[PDB]
Write a protein that binds this ligand. Sequence first.
Ligand code: ADP
Ligand code: ADP
Ligand code: ZN
Ligand code: ZN
Lengths: 574, 582
Amino acid sequence: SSLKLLFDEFLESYYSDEIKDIIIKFPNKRSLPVNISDLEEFDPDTATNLIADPEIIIDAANESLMGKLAGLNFDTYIPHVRFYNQSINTPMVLNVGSAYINKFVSIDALVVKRSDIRPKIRDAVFVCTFCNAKVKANLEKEEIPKVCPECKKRTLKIVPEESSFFNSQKIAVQDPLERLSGSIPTWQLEAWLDDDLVNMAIPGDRIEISGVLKIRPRKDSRGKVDPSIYSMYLNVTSLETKQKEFADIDISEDEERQIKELSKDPEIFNKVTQSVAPSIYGYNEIKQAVALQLFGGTPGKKLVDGGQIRSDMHILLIGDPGSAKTRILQSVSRLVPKGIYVSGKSVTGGGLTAVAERDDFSEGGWTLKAGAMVLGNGGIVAIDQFDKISEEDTAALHEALESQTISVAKAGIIATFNAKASVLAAANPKFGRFDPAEQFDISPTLLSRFDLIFPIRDIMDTELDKSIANYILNQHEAAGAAIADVPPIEHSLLKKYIAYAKRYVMPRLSEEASNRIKEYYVDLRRAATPITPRQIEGLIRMAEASAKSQLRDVVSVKDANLAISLSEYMLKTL
Amino acid sequence: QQTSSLKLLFDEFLESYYSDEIKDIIIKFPNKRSLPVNISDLEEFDPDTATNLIADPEIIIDAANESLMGKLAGLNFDTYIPHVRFYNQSINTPMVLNVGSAYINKFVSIDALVVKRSDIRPKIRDAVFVCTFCNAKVKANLEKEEIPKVCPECKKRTLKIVPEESSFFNSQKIAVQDPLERLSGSIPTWQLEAWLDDDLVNMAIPGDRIEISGVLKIRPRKDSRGKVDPSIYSMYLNVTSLETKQKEFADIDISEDEERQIKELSKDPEIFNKVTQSVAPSIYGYNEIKQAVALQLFGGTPGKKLVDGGQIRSDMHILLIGDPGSAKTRILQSVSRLVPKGIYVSGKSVTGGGLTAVAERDDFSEGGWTLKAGAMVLGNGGIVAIDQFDKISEEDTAALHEALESQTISVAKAGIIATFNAKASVLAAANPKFGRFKYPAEQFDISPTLLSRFDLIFPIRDIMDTELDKSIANYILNQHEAAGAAIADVESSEPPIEHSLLKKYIAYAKRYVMPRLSEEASNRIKEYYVDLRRAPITPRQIEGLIRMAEASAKSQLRDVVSVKDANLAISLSEYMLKTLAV
Ligand SMILES: Nc1ncnc2c1ncn2[C@@H]1O[C@H](COP(=O)(O)OP(=O)(O)O)[C@@H](O)[C@H]1O
Ligand SMILES: Nc1ncnc2c1ncn2[C@@H]1O[C@H](COP(=O)(O)OP(=O)(O)O)[C@@H](O)[C@H]1O
Ligand SMILES: [Zn+2]
Ligand SMILES: [Zn+2]
C-alpha cells in the first residue's frame, strides 16, 4: 500500500481542488489529468518508475483517487488518473518498437481512423453449461475464467445480461506529415481508447497521445499465428491536444481574472492589432481588420423568420507580387489555434468546397472527401491565390461565405454541410502587375460576399523604402544573433483572451450606433463597386467585433466609427 | 405479481388517454394495429412507470402490449399482433456517434438520417418444431424464448423448425447516422444498425430524417474471419417507434380544433395579404415577388387531365434575376425553410451530379441501380429552390425543359425505358451575365427555351431612391437590434400568421379545396390573352394564368375561381411584363 499512501499525499497536495471538483461532478466528469512534471517534482523516483512500470503505478494512483472520492457510487463507472506530459520516452510513431514494450510513451500523433463504439465487459458473470453455477470475474483485473469451480469442466459461458460494460474504441495513428523528411510511411500504429477517452480523438486531429505500448501475437494473411513475431498496440491513458480551437480553449479562474484586467487596458485593441502580423512593417489598416476578424461579430443572432445571421468576417487582399500577401496569410494562420493555409488552385473533386458524397463501396457509405471550408470549424481559412479558384469552387463559395453552409441534393440524400469559417483570401491581379477593380479575375457576385476588400499598391516612396529595408534587415540581424546565442501580448494569453471574448461577450447594438451606421449607409448611396444593403451588415459585424475586442456588451458610436473608418479606407483605393 | 399490477396500471392509462384511438384500432384491425403513445401522457399518469420505460423498456413495453391485447379481446391474433409504440421522450436523446454502453437495454430516441434499407425478410414468431427421432412437437415464441436446440422428450439435438405450422412477421435492416447538419467536422466512418418489425417496415426510406426510438441492444462482435471477440460487443437498435417531426403537407395531421381554427382564417378579407406578408419577413418590399411566392405555395388545382388523358401542370415556377445584393438568396432560403421539406441547391453541378440526375441500371452497383437522385426527383411536390440558375450545366439545361413542363424525367438507357417523377415547384434565382445588370432577357445566360417554362420572371433593379435606402436601412437595423437585445433578454423596440398555423392552412387548402374556373373569371383571362397578344408571347401564358388564378381561389379556401382571382393573376403578369420591357 506504500504507493497508494504515497499518492494520497501527492494528490492532496497538488490536485485537491480538482479532486473536489470531481467529487461534485462524478460520474459526468470522472478523470483527473495529472502533470508528470508535478510528480517528478514531488518524488523523482516515483516519476521514473512510472515510465518503466506504468501499469502498476497507474493502478496505485487510480486506487488513491477512488479513495479520495469517498462516498460515491462506483458500481457503474470507475475514476481514472490520466497522466500526461513527459519527455523521457517521446518516440515517433514509425520508431515505436520493442524497446517501449509495457513502458509509458507519449507520441505526437495524427489520428487517421476511428472505429465504432464497441461495448466491452468489465464485471463479468459466467454460467456453467454443465452444472449451472455462477462464476464472477473482473476482466479488467484477471483473465477470462475457464472452468466451473464445482464440477471442474471447461464449460463457463458468459452472461452479458448480468455483466457490466464500458466503452472502447480503435484508432489508427501516424506521424504528422509535418515531421516526415520524405515519403509517407505505409503503416499506422493501433491505439485503444476506453471509457471517457472514446470519441475524443477524431480523425485529422493532432494529439499528444500517451499511454502504454503493448504487444500481441501477430496474425498473418490467413490468420495463422506466428512463430515468435508480435504486433503492437498502444493503450491510451491520456490525450493532450496541445493547440486547441478557441471554443475548446480552457481558461482558468485566475486566467479569467487576468483576461478581465486586460479588458480595462484602453489600448487593448491596438495591442491585439499589433500582434496580427508582427513580421511585416506597415499595413496597419489590414491588421486592424484582421484583428477585428479574429474576435468576430456577435454570434447567435436570428432574423424574424429564424434565419441565422453571419457573424464571421471575410477579408480579401489584392496586390502585386511582393505585397506581403502570402506572409500575412501565413502568419495569421499560425496565430489562430487551428488555422488552415491553402492555395486556391484545385483539381476537380479536390476543391475548397469539397463535401462528402455517398458510395456504397466505401467505409461508412460516404466518400472520404472534405475541403478547407468544411474543416474550418469556425477558424480562419487562409486562401492564397484566390484568382486561381475553380469554377466549381467559385459557385459553391457563394453559399459557403454567406450562409456558412454547403447544400447538396445527391445520391438521394438532401443535406446541408456546415462550413462556418472566416476566410482571409489573397489574390494577385490579372496579367501580373497592377495598372483597380477590373483587373482581379474574381467574379463580381463572389466579391460581394467579402466584407472588406483591400487593394495593395506600391507607391514606391523612397523614404518608405528605406524604412522597409531597415526593418527587414533588423529582423535578420536578430535571427542571426539568436543562432549565435549572444511582444504586445503573450501568445498564449492572446488566444485565451480572444476565446473568452468569443464565448462570453455577445455585443448588442445601441440606438446611437445603429443610427450612425444607418446615416453612413444612406450617405454612401448618394453619389466601381455597387453599394447594396449587404454593406450595412458588414458595418454591423465589424462594429460588434470592436465591442467584443474590448469585452464590452454594447456597441458604441466609437465602435461604429472604427467600422466606418475601415470601410472608407477600403473605398479610398477606388 | 408485479407484471399483473403493471397490466392494470396500463389498462387504466389507456382508457384514460387513448380510448378513442384504441377503438379505431378495434375497427380497422389488422390494417391498423399500432397505437402511438406519447410518453408525456405516461409522465402524467404515473411518473414512476415513465422512468421505468427509460430504464426497463422491454418489461413495461411487453406489459403495455399485453394490456392492449386485453383491450382488443375478441379480435384474431393468429397472424398479426397489436403494438404499443411509445414516443416523445427527452431523457435519453443521444447522437448516433455517442450511443454507447450507457444505453444498453435502455430506451433511446435519436435524430437520424436513414441511409440504407434492406429487403423485407419474413421472420418467424410463433414457431413449431418437430423431432426427427421422436416426432415430438415443441412450440415456442422466438421473440420471447430462444430457439429450442435439444428435444425435451428424446434429449438429443434433432429439433427441426416447421415453417408451415409457424407464424411470420416482416423484418427489415436499416442503416442510420446523424444528420450531416448536426456533425461539426468530418463524417464518421460508421453507422448504426437498426431493425424494423411488422408494420414499421418500409417506413424508413433512405434519405428521411426520423426521430427513431427503441431499445438499444448488444450482440457479440465478430472478427473479419467470423471469430467472436472475447468480451467485445456490437450494437443494434430494435426500433419501437418512428416519429417524423417535419411531415410533408399531405402527411400533416389536422385536428378538428385546427380545422375550426383554420376555417376562421379563411373568412378574414385579407388572408392573402396576410399570407403574402409571411413569405420572406426578413426582406423589405418585394411585394409582387412575395405575392407570387405566396400563390406558388398553394398551387393550382391538381388532378386536371386533358382530353387525351395527359396532365395539366398545377405547380408554379418562378425565376428571379437580379443584381448581387438584391436579396435573391435569402428569399430562396426563406421559402425553403417555410415549406415543410424544402430543398435549397446551387445550379452548379458536375457531370452525373445534376439536379435532373436519375438512377441508371448497373449490375455492378448494389441492387442493380446507381445511387443517383437529384433535387427534382427528390422534390416530392415541395419547392425546390435553385440558386445560381445561370450556372446550370448543359445536361441539366436540357433535362429541365421536360422536368418543368411535364414534371417527369424520361430516359431510355441500359435497356430500360422509363419516366421518373419530378414533381416540384421551382423557385430559381440567377445573376446577370458579366456581373451587374437594355433588354433584360439578353442580360442573363439562360436558354430562351428554358425561360419559356417559368410562369413568372421577376427582374430586380436598384432604383437608388434615397428614401428607399433610408427605409431599408431602418428596417435592417431594427431587425438586428432586436435580435441582439433578445440575446440578452432585455427588450427595446410578429408574423401575421403563426408558422405552424400557416403550414396547416396551406396543407388543408391543398387537400380539400380544388378550384374550378367560373365562366366569369374564365372570360376575363380568355379575353386578356388576345389583347395582350396585340403588339415572345405564347399560348402557355394562358395556362400560367389559370394556374395562378386557381391558386388565388385556393388561397382563400374557395371552390370557384372568381374574376377577382383572375385579376390578381393578371396583375402579376402585368408586373412581369412591365418589369421586363426595358
Ligand atoms: N511591409 C512590407 N511590405 C511588403 N513586403 C514586405 C514588408 N515587410 C517585409 N516584406 C517582404 O515582402 C515579401 C513577402 O511577400 P510574400 O507574400 O511572401 O510574397 P508574395 O506577396 O508575392 O506572395 C518578403 O520578401 C518580405 O520580406
Ligand atoms: N430588404 C432588402 N432589400 C434588398 N436587399 C437586402 C435586403 N435585406 C438584405 N439584403 C441583402 O441582400 C443580400 C442577398 O444576396 P443576393 O442578392 O442573393 O446575392 P446574389 O444576388 O449574388 O445572389 C443579402 O446579403 C442581404 O444582406
Ligand atoms: Zn460446473
Ligand atoms: Zn426427440
